[PDB]
Symmetry: C6
Subunit: 321 residues, 6 copies
Amino acid sequence: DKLKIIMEKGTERLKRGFAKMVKGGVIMDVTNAEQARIAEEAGAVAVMALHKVPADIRKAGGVARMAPVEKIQEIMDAVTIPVMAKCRIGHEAEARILEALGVDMIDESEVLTPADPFFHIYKKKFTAPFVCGARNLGEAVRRIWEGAAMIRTKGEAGTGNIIEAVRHVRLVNENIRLIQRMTDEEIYGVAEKFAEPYLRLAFSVKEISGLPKRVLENEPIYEGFTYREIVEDIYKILLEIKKLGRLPVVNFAAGGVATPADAALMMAMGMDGVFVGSGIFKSSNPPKMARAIVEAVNHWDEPDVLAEISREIGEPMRGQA
Amino acid sequence: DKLKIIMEKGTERLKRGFAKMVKGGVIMDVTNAEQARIAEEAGAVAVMALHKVPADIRKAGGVARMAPVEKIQEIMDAVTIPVMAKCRIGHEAEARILEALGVDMIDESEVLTPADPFFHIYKKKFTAPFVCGARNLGEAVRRIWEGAAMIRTKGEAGTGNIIEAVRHVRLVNENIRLIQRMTDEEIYGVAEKFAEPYLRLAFSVKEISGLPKRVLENEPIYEGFTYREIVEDIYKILLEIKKLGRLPVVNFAAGGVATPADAALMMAMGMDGVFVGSGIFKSSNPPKMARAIVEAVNHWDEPDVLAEISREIGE
Amino acid sequence: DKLKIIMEKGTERLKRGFAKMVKGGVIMDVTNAEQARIAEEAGAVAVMALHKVPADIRKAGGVARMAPVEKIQEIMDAVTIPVMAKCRIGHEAEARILEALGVDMIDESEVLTPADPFFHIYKKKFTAPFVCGARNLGEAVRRIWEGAAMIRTKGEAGTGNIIEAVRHVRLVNENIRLIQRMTDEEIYGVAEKFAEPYLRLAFSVKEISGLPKRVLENEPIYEGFTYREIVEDIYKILLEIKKLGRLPVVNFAAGGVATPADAALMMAMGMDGVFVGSGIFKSSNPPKMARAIVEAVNHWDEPDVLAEISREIGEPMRGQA
Amino acid sequence: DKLKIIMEKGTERLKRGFAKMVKGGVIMDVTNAEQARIAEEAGAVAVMALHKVPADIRKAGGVARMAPVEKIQEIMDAVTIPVMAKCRIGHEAEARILEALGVDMIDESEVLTPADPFFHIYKKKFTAPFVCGARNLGEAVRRIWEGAAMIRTKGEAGTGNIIEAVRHVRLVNENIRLIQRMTDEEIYGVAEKFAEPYLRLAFSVKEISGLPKRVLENEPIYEGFTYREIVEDIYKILLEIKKLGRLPVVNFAAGGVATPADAALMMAMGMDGVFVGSGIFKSSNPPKMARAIVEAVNHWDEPDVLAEISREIGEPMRGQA
Amino acid sequence: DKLKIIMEKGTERLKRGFAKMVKGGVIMDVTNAEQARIAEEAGAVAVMALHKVPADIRKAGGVARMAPVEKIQEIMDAVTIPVMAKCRIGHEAEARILEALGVDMIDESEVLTPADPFFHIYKKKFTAPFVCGARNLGEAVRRIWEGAAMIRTKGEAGTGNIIEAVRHVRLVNENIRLIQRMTDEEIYGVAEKFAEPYLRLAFSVKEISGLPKRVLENEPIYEGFTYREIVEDIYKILLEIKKLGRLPVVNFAAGGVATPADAALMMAMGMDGVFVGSGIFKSSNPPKMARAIVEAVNHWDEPDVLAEISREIGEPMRGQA
Amino acid sequence: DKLKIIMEKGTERLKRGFAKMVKGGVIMDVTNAEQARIAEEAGAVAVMALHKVPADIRKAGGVARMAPVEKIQEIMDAVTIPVMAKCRIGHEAEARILEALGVDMIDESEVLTPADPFFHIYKKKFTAPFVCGARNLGEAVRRIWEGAAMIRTKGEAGTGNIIEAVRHVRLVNENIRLIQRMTDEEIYGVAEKFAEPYLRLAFSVKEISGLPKRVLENEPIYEGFTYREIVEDIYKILLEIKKLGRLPVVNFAAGGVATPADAALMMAMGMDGVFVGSGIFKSSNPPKMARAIVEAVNHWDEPDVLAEISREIGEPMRGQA
């Protein structure tokens, strides 16, 4: 047909466009409307609604799910900047609920307890735009194909340690520079590999059925798509990245960003922005810490200014090695 | 002979028919007459009777058996809706007891402590209908062949984690779509695969006897059936499945269904209904939360409603 | 020889004969006279005398021996029904002390700390009848050849988990059906297999002496017999088993029976009778719980009766899963 | 020298002559003058002097040595029956001290902490006779060759469990019947196997020196004896055991004897007598346990007496593993 | 153009120059202003600034970051000797701040939680001089190609154990002695080796991309250079070393220096000076222990003085095993 | 050329002669003056100055270094017999302080925390005499070549277990006998082996450099010596050992001497004397136990006397097994 192409396109651009306006900023994690207020007052271009911090209980033996709906409502009310909420990997009901509730963006989040061990949410079917984590280029591209409108690093949550975030950024960038040194048929090789994870359910079922674990040409693997059809779509996304030299979506740093210096570092690595959660609340005057983070991002190239922002800002959390 | 077939078909259908009546509802685990009352008031379509929670017994590393008879009877005497009860895998006698006690459906359950390491109950012999667990299409078909009237997922009991139920639904569902893309010959092979588990006893014995672990053509392996005979029957079941594009019996989610959200998710994956556990009765307001689950199962296709259902304060 | 073949044929018919005298009922484990009294009031066709619970000594990290003669006395001087006692495996002196002490039958039991790493008591040289455990046909045939008058399943002692009992019955029963389907050439092979455990001591010695671990034609191995001579006898015990489709001796179920449903189950699997142990101690109501077991064995094919019998009882031993 | 062989042989006969004096009775471990008298009054043939019970030293992380001289002396001055004492394996100075103190026999004991990783004491040099433990014929023979006047099972010290003693008796006996079905040529091979452990120090030093671990035909390996020379002596001892059908020296069970039935059992296995240690003074009523065991050894082939002997003797030791 | 080229190849020579100032002296880790003084008065040629000890932070599993700008400031305000601060490996931003804050030298220290898992800071782009730790020659040459002005041993911090410093020193020196023995072609191959670590990211990314891990002649690996480009630069540095028989920059000992004797030992091994951190900390009489270590370095080839130097010094600082 | 090596043979022999002085004696580890005084009173021919009895700093997970100079001076002034002191292995600085301090002997000791991971102190350059431990002939001969004046067995420190001392005495002894049975050429091959450990640092550096681990005939490996030069010197000491029938230096026993009999054992093995430390002071009654060890070394061959000496001597340290 001639539509559904200029329609699906227009719908994709719309979503990606939303994410654009949070560029150059800091998205802060808040647990109560009190916090949501400090955050807006500090310069957060957005907030991330939480009840308990997913990083401990579950990670003191629990299951971390969607935040309670009323607790989210309360946060959307208290502030005028956009508000986000997390859902569990693959949990379509949670996501829809978060979307009927009218959140601005949904985080399909590895920090919550995953709910489908095979498949992420097919985000292209939603109206709310999604942000998703990636540890490397393959992850970023899979999430994007699925419909992700924004990408952040997975990093290392709850630890306040920047290392993992840096690894992910580098893994993604080096994989882009590699794609650019590549021929079109080489790039299609990468697309095949990047599409292997979608096979996981088909292969398990083959083994349960006593058949050999190999790809079959016409067999739907995910949401009606054949393996080849996924490769092809990923390929196109890979050429688009070859041309742009970065992800075709807004791309943030997340996980372990604990100080103005940490924040400046990701910007220096070419990130569009920064998520921070634990880092801030804690310390003896966090409103200043929150503000520091905000300022480090605006002035990430000016050392003399970062040194000023840093002067007396509180006490950054005890992390985890 | 030919009247035998007609019988097997009619009894099957009578049993499967009972399960259809709970289709589309929430079955709740209860530990007393008070709780079974809360459930019936909330809209549960049936309740599962227990005394102590098996998940609890086995975290403390106990043996988990069928609940005490007098206790099952207290729950039956509290409610008008169907009452279910659990027995240990292979525990023929626990199951004959529950049937004679007059429970509506028996759950041959893997959270109780298995009683048979080789074989499940031959459900076909019972007049009471059974529900069994399945982790994959292979288990489900084995249970159906043994005479299960109803299948649920095994999931992960007592965690609140939905992940393991989702895995099993995805494992069964994909396996069915696979079946539908197959020739009748190729399916016979899957059948050959799904009957393999019935050989564990014969093979153990052959090892104990210094013999090699091989199938024999006329060696009766289970309840009089030889391996080839079970493969034949299973094959027929696989063929019925190909036509239907789903299991031929009511099929429910169970194991970790802890939120209206979770309940909706399973219904969106084609499950006929949801089992929920004692979890509901810990927490501020057990009725209401029970009503939230029941309503989630009634409105799983409309997020606006689920969102209001979720929004309950608790006070 | 002439009068020789008749001697033990008639000697064994005579011992096995005693067993036939309890087939069809329950045998309870009693640690005193007040419990042996309670037990007879429930119908127990016999009792097993205990000082302490082997299971409990074992869980304690200790050595479990035959009971104090005085404790055995206080039991045989409390009831009219037959009395049995456990001896450690291989402990010929413990068994003599029990035979001399009068007791009706000795249980050579693996719940007690084993006293011989290689051989069991050659029971044929005794006057008292013996019951031995078996976990599969090979074990039962071996015990019977040694002269056991009665065979029981080993099950899993002290757990209250009937599953091990079930396993041992199915292993024995299926092994018998396999036998019924074999040619004599073939059963001889099973015989060869079944006699191998007797070679353990000879093989350990060959190893200590710098020699190859192999069988020789005239090496007496146990109580006089060669490997070959054991093969032939066991082989004959096999053929006998083929003709009956069961064991040539009474065959009970022990280990794990914690409820009347459990007892019912074992009868329905073709067990001559049932052993139960101290599950009745902490019952919490022992006189009651003990009657239930007895009725259940009596009306095992009657689900409506089993339902009533199960009506009420204490909390019947938590078990170990 | 012909004459030197006759000192060897004649001195040796005299030593064995002392061991024959304790044949048929019970030797008790004692820790003080009070237990010494209890042991003697109960009917011991000898006592064995130790400080702490070792292995109690070894339950603790401890080093177990020869008992203090004042203690051994307190015991010799408390009884008329022979007093024995332990030294650490290879501890030649300890054994000389014991000899100088007046003990009638020295037990080079595995239950103390060994003081030599390669060699035992060359006991022929001594005037006091030694007793040594053995786990198998290989060991018994080696200890005999080195000059043991007496051999006991090693069993399993301070557990109360008889199984390890029963293991070692059966290993030694079965190995003896093995010799007897063998040719002098075959037996020679077993002697070579039985002398390999004297090579332990030589091979280690080879490896440290960079040379292959091989035997050299005139290399002196222990007390001036060469490997070959030792194989010869061991080989003659084996021929001797072939003819005798037992060890050429007095042979006692030891390790885990905890009850009169244990004692009866060992005698029924053709042992000469019994050491008993923990079994008596770790029980609740030591004086009574002690006489019962003594009477058990004397009437081991009379079950009716063993039964009366076993009536009311107190609670045995726990014990272990 | 040619002026920037010029003044740039000369700022390297310049930074190395700076390090010469601290030669023959002691550098001390300080945590507050008080301590800074004690250490200038004691004779430190320089102090190292922390708020807390990284060791303590990591023995307790937290995240060791840059010190607070306050604490660094106060310290800089308390002394006239050159002041140093540590930053996390790879933390471009933490360094730029320190430089932009006035610090005389930056330590890219492995005792702070690393920030980049692939690459160290490109120190040549910096104005401030950097010190870096080395375990062996390849590591030293790598930190030198990246622009380090001075090198120290990594040793082992927070342990008071000098043996790791000594190993690193020996590994370096022996490697240099080995360079001095090679033809230029062999030194090239070493250089090929010394550059491999730069391929970590490229290799990780190729694996994620599904491609064989191989080197590609024209692909930039680090800060624009290809592998081949790095190999050549590292080869030139080995060549300058083959001629100096030494490292082309100042070279100190660090980690595990705890007593005058240790300080002296490091000077005896050819080092330019010592870092000390924990040593002085918590020492009975801080000033005394401080001067003692300094005097030790000044008079390290004069044992008679060392002796009187240690005479009644308040210490000895316990450290892990 | 060889007008230069005679000053050497001169100072070396002068050194060895000093150890000749403490022969036939007991050296006792002491930790203060009172203890030192006891040691001299009991008849020690020397004390070893210690600040923390063997393995205590080990047992507290610490770093064990040279003792405080002020505590060594205390001891030197409290006795008249030679005072020895310990230094860390390879810690030249610690040694030069000890020499400069006037101590009579330096024990480069494996019970202190080693300071060099590759090399021991090159003792020839010292004027003060050194004692070194050894586990086997190889280790002895290395320590000797490096200039040890006396050797001690290492055994195991602070365990009270004599067994490790015996292992070492016997490994050296047997190795010496094997030498004496060897053709001069064979001996050369042993000297090649004993030289290998000096390749350790070289091979390390090669592996880091990408080079194959090989020996190159001209490379200075340790203190200017090539590998082959080392092999040559050790060959020479071997041949001396072939003539002497023992070590060219005084050779003591150490590690695990806890009782008078232990001490007598080591003398009966050929040892010259005994280091004791823990044995005496980790003992209920030191001074009496002190006199007993001494008396025991003076009468190691008189059993009647060892017995009296052993009377009422107190309880020895418990030990570790």
